[PDB]
Amino acid sequence: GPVPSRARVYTDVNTHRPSEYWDYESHVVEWGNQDDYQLVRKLGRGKYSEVFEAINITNNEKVVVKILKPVAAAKIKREIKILENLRGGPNIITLADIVKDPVSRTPALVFEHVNNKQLYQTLTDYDIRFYMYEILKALDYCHSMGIMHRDVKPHNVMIDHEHRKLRLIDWGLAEFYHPGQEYNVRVASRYFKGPELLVDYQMYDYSLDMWSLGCMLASMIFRKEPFFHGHDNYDQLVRIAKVLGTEDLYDYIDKYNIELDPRFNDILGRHSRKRWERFVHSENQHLVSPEALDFLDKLLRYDHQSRLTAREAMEHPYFYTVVK
Ligand SMILES: NCc1cc(Cl)cc(-c2cccc3[nH]ccc23)c1
Numbered sequence: 001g002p003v004p005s006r007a008r009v010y011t012d013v014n015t016h017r018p019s020e021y022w023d024y025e026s027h028v029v030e031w032g033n034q035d036d037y038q039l040v041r042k043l044g045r046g047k048y049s050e051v052f053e054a055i056n057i058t059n060n061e062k063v064v065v066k067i068l069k070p071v072a073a074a075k076i077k078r079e080i081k082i083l084e085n086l087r088g089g090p091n092i093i094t095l096a097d098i099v100k101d102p103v104s105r106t107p108a109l110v111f112e113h114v115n116n117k118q119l120y121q122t123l124t125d126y127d128i129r130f131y132m133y134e135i136l137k138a139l140d141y142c143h144s145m146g147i148m149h150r151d152v153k154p155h156n157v158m159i160d161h162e163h164r165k166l167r168l169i170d171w172g173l174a175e176f177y178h179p180g181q182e183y184n185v186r187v188a189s190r191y192f193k194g195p196e197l198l199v200d201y202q203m204y205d206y207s208l209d210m211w212s213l214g215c216m217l218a219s220m221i222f223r224k225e226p227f228f229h230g231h232d233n234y235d236q237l238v239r240i241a242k243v244l245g246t247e248d249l250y251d252y253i254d255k256y257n258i259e260l261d262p263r264f265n266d267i268l269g270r271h272s273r274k275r276w277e278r279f280v281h282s283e284n285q286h287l288v289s290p291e292a293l294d295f296l297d298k299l300l301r302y303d304h305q306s307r308l309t310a311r312e313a314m315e316h317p318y319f320y321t322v323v324k
Contacts, residue, residue: 003256006179007205009309013146022176024081032097048072062113082174091138093169114167117154125287128220129322138168140310143206146177150187152212191226195302198237199258207304214299221292223284245273252302291318
């Protein structure tokens with residue numbers, strides 16, 4: 001069968017934990033009071049939830065309320081456990097309350113207010129490096145705590161540009177990393193899906209978030225939204241193969257003894273690996289540097305084991321110019 005894989009960092013953090021840390025189903029929810037809050041307006045609608053601006057009418061504090069649709073509601077114990085385990089961490093959203101509506105019979109997660117994808121195509125070279133470092137602080141933190149985010153994308157990064165503050169949000173797909181565990185490949189949003197997901201390789205790890213991060217980086221420095229514009233999950237892999245090449249793609253599936261879905265035979269073809277300088281033009285050359293290209297190259301690798309971890313990414317010369 002497929003060759004097994006392990007994370008090369010934080011491999012055994014959850015195995016040393018008392019079961020309460022990762023055994024989220026065992027967690028008993030302490031429901032707060034929904035009457036403490038008044039919903040002001042809907043901020044967005046997704047397949048998993050609806051997000052609203054709200055006020056805690058007791059203290060007059062602004063909050064963000066995420067009302068969960070049935071698919072997300074069924075996994076609420078996992079998301080709560082992850083949010084509580086990570087609360088206080090660098091650039092992680094703060095879960096403030098857990099409430100249940102007796103009217104609709106649905107649960108909601110209440111978060112401390114965060115000010116705010118329209119911004120990330122507008123940043124200077126310095127601000128891309130600065131904001132990328134802030135995202136890396138959150139990814140190193142959750143990875144070090146044995147958690148994979150699995151949905152890194154611009155919409156899950158809330159930027160308060162006036163105060164140069166950033167939060168990694170929507171931990172709804174986040175999961176505890178257990179070495180040797182086979183995970184569901186139906187995670188992350190299409191343009192940010194790692195090759196491992198697209199080839200149905202289930203024994204993935206934290207490195208998945210590093211591919212997603214590279215997609216965000218490629219989009220920012222090249223001003224190409226999204227960077228890998230797949231029509232569907234099959235065309236998503238073809239778009240990646242037109243950039244990274246088919247030769248390294250086949251070496252990847254060979255290393256892990258994976259077989260592509262035969263439908264790739266009439267759509268994949270053969271593609272040379274392109275050099276990153278190929279995506280440089282007059283409108284984006286001020287955002288590109290040899291350090292940016294070297295860094296990007298080291299994130300966007302087929303082999304999930306060969307990608308920089310969050311910590312190695314923070315050591316990259318691309319971040320030497322960022323005040324620490
Ligand atoms: N006091 C009104 C209020 C405050 C908050 Cl924080 C939430 C809700 C709500 C409305 C509709 C569906 C829901 N599911 C879970 C909560 C919820 C109502």
